[PDB]
Amino acid sequence: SDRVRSITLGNSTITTQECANVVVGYGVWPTYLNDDEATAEDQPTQPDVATCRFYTLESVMWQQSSPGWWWKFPDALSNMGLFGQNMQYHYLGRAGYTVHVQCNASKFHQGCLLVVCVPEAEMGCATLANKPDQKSLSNGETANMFESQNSTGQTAVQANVINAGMGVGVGNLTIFPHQWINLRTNNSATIVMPYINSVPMDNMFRHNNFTLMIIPFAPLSYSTGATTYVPITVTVAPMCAEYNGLRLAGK
Amino acid sequence: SDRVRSITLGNSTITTQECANVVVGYGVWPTYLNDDEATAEDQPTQPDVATCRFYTLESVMWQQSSPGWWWKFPDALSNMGLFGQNMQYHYLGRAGYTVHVQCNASKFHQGCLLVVCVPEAEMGCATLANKPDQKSLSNGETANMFESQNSTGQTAVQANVINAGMGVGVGNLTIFPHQWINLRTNNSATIVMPYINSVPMDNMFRHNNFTLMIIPFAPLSYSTGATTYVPITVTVAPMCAEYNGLRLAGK
Amino acid sequence: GAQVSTQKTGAHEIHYTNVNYYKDAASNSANRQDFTQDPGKFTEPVKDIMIKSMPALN
Amino acid sequence: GAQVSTQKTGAHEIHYTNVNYYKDAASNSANRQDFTQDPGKFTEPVKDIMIKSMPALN
Amino acid sequence: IARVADTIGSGPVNSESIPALTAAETGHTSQVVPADTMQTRHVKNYHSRSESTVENFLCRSACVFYTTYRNHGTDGDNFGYWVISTRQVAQLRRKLEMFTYARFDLELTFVITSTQEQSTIQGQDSPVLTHQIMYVPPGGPVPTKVNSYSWQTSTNPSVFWTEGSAPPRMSIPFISIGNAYSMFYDGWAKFDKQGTYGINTLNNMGTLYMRHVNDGSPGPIVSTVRIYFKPKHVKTWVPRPPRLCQYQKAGNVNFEPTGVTESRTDITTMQTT
Amino acid sequence: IARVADTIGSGPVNSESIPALTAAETGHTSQVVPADTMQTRHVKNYHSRSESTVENFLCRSACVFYTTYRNHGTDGDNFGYWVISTRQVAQLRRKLEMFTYARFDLELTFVITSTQEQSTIQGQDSPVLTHQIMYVPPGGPVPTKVNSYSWQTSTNPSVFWTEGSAPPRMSIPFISIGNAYSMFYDGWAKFDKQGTYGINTLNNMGTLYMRHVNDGSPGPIVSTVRIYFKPKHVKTWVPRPPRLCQYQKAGNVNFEPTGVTESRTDITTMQTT
Ligand SMILES: CCCCCCCCCCCCCCCC(=O)O
Ligand SMILES: CCCCCCCCCCCCCCCC(=O)O
Ligand SMILES: CCCCCCCCCCCCCC(=O)O
Ligand SMILES: CCCCCCCCCCCCCC(=O)O
C-alpha cells in the first residue's frame, strides 16, 4: 500500500512497512548546481555513489521524561565515510539530504514525536552576554538533548524545549518541513531536504545550515510489563553532493 | 616547438620547455572499464577531478655514486590526498598514470638516467630462503635506493642494480615503456601508463602492479665550482581512476 | 565440415585437410600459422608521429 | 549422414564433425551440450503469479 | 547457450515498490537481483552454466566395484561374480541419489589387472592371459564351476579380453521395466508388507561372472576386475537433498544421526573457517 | 605470410634529411633501414618470420616434473603426487617468463617407465602393469593410501594406462579464474601484506596422484612418471627481459647476482669469442 516504501541510495537501502509519506522539502527535489547559478570556476567533484548514500547516526533512548534531541548537519556527517573525507579536502560543498527517523513500538505504546528540519537554526546561549561554545551547538554524530527546564552555563545553549533553543514557539515549528511519528500510526518519518542557502555553495565546516529536531509532544507511555527501551535511530543520506576548492585537508 | 609541452590534469599543471616526447604505454591511452569487460556489479565511484590530478613525491639528490631509485605504485600514492582516501574505503580500484620525472642541470653537467615503468616488478630477497619484508619493497612516498654491490639482510631486497632487483639484465629493461633523461638534451621524461593487469580491477593495497625505476647509466659529472646538488622530482597523476566495493576504511 | 588449408611450402619455385573430432575447442591442434605483427607498440610508443627523415627534436 | 556442430569455445573474442557407427541409439556419445533451464518448477511453484515489486501478502 | 543473466543498470529509488520484502511462508523463492537493493552498473555477463547440466555432472566414469579371482582355485571355484548395484560405493551413490528418478544409458568399462602371488614354483614363464566376463540376466543359468557349460554364452552377452590391450568397453541401454530408474523406494516387496522394505525391492539387474579363459599355469596368479559405470543420455526427476550422513548398507538408507554442519565458537566468530 | 620487407634501391644522396641522427631519449626505436645510409640494390626478400611466432616458440612438449612410486610400499604410502606448477624446471620456466601474462590451452602427455629393483625374490614373472593418474582439483578429497576410496574417481578426472602402449595424452583448456595466467605477481596474499609474497599467491592449480592399479607382486618395482606440458592456442602480453640469473626456488624469483655478460680482455679485442 502507501504505508510501505523503500529508498535505495548507493549501496544502501531502507525498507519501511509502516510509514506515512515522504515530505519533500518545499516541493523541490535536490539537484546539481547549474552553470547559470554557479560562480566557482573549477570543475567540481561529484563522487555520486561513495558519498550519496545512507549513514546511520548514534541512537538515543526514548524515555518518559525525554524533552527531545537535535543534530546539526553536515556536522553530524563530518566523520561519516567518504562524505566526511570530501568535506575536509574541499573549501566549498553542496548537498541535499534524505532524512529517515525510525522508532518502533509495541502497539500498546503511545507517544508522538515531532520530526522537523529547521534551516539556519541559530541557537541562543544560556548566559545572555556570552555565546554558546562549539560543542554545545553540535556534538557531531551524537545528539544534543533539549531540557525541560531553564539551562545554566557560561557557554551552554539555552536548551529549554519550549522555545526550541531559538526563542520561538515550539508549536510553531511546523512552518518548516516536518513530520510526526505517532506510535499508533507509523514507526518512521522521512524528509527530503534540498540545499537551502543564500549562496550556491558554502563551507561545510563553519556552516550547517539546517538542524534536525526530534521533540516528543505526547510523552512515551506504556503499562508495566511492556518493553521500556524504545530507541530512535536516525539515517541521513546526502543527495547530489558536489565539491569545489580542493586543497590540503582540514578541518 | 616539440621540446615544449604542458599537461593539465585537475587543478594541476606541468610545463616543460626541454622535453623529448611523451611515451604512451604500449600505444594505449588509459580509459574506463567497459560493461563487457566489467565483472563487479555495483556502480563504481569516479571522483575524476579530486583524484585524477598531479601529486609530487619526495625528491632525491642525484650524486656521482647513486646507483638508482625505485617507487612502487599505487603504494607511493596511498597517502596522497583523496586518491589515497578512496583507496582505503574501497575493495577494488583501477587507474592509469601519467609519470613525470624532472631533473635539470647547468649545461656543463653530464649524465644519463633511464626512466622506466616495469609492470609486475616482483623483486627478490637478499637471503635466498627468505622473502623481502614489506618496507624493503615499497617505502610509499619515499624512494628505495638501488645498491652498486650485493645486498645483505634476512628481509632485505637484493638491490644490486646490475640485475635491477628482478634477476634480469638491467640493460634489457628497455623492453618496458621507458625514456631517458640525458642532461645535454632534456631535463624531464614523461610516460603515460594504462592499467595493466590480468583482472579488470584489483585491490590497490596488496598489489601494485608496476614499479618506477630511475637508473643512471652515465654517472653525474661536473667540474669543480659548479652546483653539486642535482635533485630528481617525481610527479605522478592517476588517470581515469574508478573504485568499487565501498566499506569501512583500511588499510 | 572439412577445412582445406595451404601447407607451409618454400618460396621462389600443396593443401592439407582438417576435421575436428571433439566437442571442445581446446581439443584442436595448435595455430601454427597465425602470422600477425604489430611492433609499433614497443618500438614507437611515443605520442607524436616522429617522422624518420626529420630531426627528432627541434 | 555427417553432423557438423559447433565446438565449445570461449566468449568475448570452430566446428566438429560427427558420424554414428552403430545401429543402436544408446551406442552414441553423451549429450554434452543440452542446455535447457526451467527453474520455475522449484522456485515459484505457487498458484498466483506473485509479482516481485508487489507485496507478497496484502 | 546456458548463459547467465546480464546485470542491468539501476540508479537511486524512492517509491512504494518493495522488492526486498516478501513472504517466505508462501514457499516461493524470491527473485530479487542485486539491481533491486543498490545502484548497479551494466555488466555483460558471458558466464555459462554448461558444466552444471545433469549430463555433464553425471557423465564421468566411476568405479562401482572390484573383485578378485585366481587361476588355481579349488575345485574350482576360481572365478568371480558381482550382483549388479550402484549402491556399494559412496561417491557415485551420492550423485545418483540427488534425484528420485533417472533414465539413462550406460557406458561400461573394465580394468583387469593381474598379480603374481608368493610361491616357490620357479621358474615361471606364463603366456598372456585372457579373461571372460559373462553377464547373466535374472533367471538365466548360473556358472557353478570355472569350466561349467554356462560359459558357452550362446545367448548371454560376454566380452573376451586379452591383457596388454585397451580396457574393454560396451554400451548398455536403459533396461528397467519401469519408466525410470528409482533411487528411492518407500514401500515393501510383498502386499502384506512383510519382507524387504526399500530400494532393494527393485534391484533385479542381474549378475556378472569373471574367469580366466586360460588353463591354470603352475605359478599362482590373482586377477582383480574393476567395473566402471558412466551414465549417458541422462534425464532426472524430483531432486532431493544430498546425503548428509555416511552410508552403512547397500540395500537400505540406514544411517547414524549426524550433526547439521561443523560447529563454530559463537554466533559472530568470523573464523569459519 | 610473415614475410620480411624487401630492400629498396637507393643511390647517392646530398640533402638536409638526417635519417641517421635521432634522439634515443624519446624511447622511440629508430626505424632506419640499410637504404638510408648507403647505396643499396633491390632485393626481393622471401624470408618469413613463421618460426618466431609465440605459438611456434611455445608449442613444444617440455618435461616439467617426474616422480617415483613403488609397488610394495609401507603401508602404503606407495604412490606419487605432484602439486602442479610450471616453475620447477629451468627450461620451460624461462620461456613462459619472457611474458607477464599468457592465455593458452595445454596438451598434457605422460611417459611412465618401470624399473626392476635389486632383490633375491627369484623367480619373478610379473604380468603387465597398469597405472592410474588421478587429478584432484583444489578442495577435493585427497588419497591417503594406495587403495583409499578417493581412487574411485567418480567426478575427478583420471586416465588409466597399461605399459607397452602409446604414452597417454589429454587436452586441458585455459582454466584460470583470472583473464590470463600470471607469470609474475608483485603483491601479497593477505591484505595486511603478511604471508606469501609473489607468484606463489596465485598457485592453486591442484595436484596429480599416481599409483599402480595392480596388486603388488613379490618382485620389487619402482615406476617414474614424467609430465610434459605443451602450450596451445597461445596469447602473450607485456614481454619482459629474459632471466639472466640462475633460478633458486620455485615459489619466488630469488636469485644470486650475476654479471651482465661474459667479460673480455679489453675494449677492442676481436676475440669475442
Ligand atoms: C558383457 C557385459 C554386459 C553387462 C551388462 C550389464 C547390464 C546391467 C544393468 C546396469 C544398469 C543398472 C542401473 C541401476 C540404477 C539404480 O538402481 O539406481
Ligand atoms: C588426468 C589428467 C588431468 C590433469 C589436469 C591438469 C590441469 C592442471 C592445470 C595446468 C595448467 C597450469 C598452468 C599455469 C601457468 C602459470 O602458473 O604460469
Ligand atoms: C587429417 C586429415 C583428415 C582426413 C579426413 C578424415 C575424417 C573424415 C572426413 C569426413 C568429411 C565429411 C565431414 C564434413 O562434412 O565436414
Ligand atoms: C569424429 C569425426 C569423424 C570423421 C568422419 C569419418 C567417418 C566417415 C565419414 C563419411 C561421411 C559420409 C557419410 C554420410 O553420408 O553421412
Automatic annotation (TrEMBL), chains E, F:
<dbReference type="InterPro" id="IPR033703">
    <property type="entry name" value="Rhv-like"/>
</dbReference>
<dbReference type="GO" id="GO:0043657">
    <property type="term" value="C:host cell"/>
</dbReference>
<protein>
    <recommendedName>
        <fullName>Genome polyprotein</fullName>
    </recommendedName>
</protein>
<keyword id="KW-0946">Virion</keyword>
<keyword id="KW-1160">Virus entry into host cell</keyword>
<feature type="domain" description="Picornavirus capsid">
    <location>
        <begin position="36"/>
        <end position="203"/>
    </location>
</feature>
<keyword id="KW-0945">Host-virus interaction</keyword>
<dbReference type="Pfam" id="PF00073">
    <property type="entry name" value="Rhv"/>
</dbReference>
<dbReference type="GO" id="GO:0005198">
    <property type="term" value="F:structural molecule activity"/>
</dbReference>
<keyword id="KW-1161">Viral attachment to host cell</keyword>
<dbReference type="GO" id="GO:0046718">
    <property type="term" value="P:symbiont entry into host cell"/>
</dbReference>
<keyword id="KW-0167">Capsid protein</keyword>
<dbReference type="GO" id="GO:0019028">
    <property type="term" value="C:viral capsid"/>
</dbReference>
<dbReference type="GO" id="GO:0019062">
    <property type="term" value="P:virion attachment to host cell"/>
</dbReference>
<dbReference type="InterPro" id="IPR029053">
    <property type="entry name" value="Viral_coat"/>
</dbReference>
<dbReference type="InterPro" id="IPR001676">
    <property type="entry name" value="Picornavirus_capsid"/>
</dbReference>
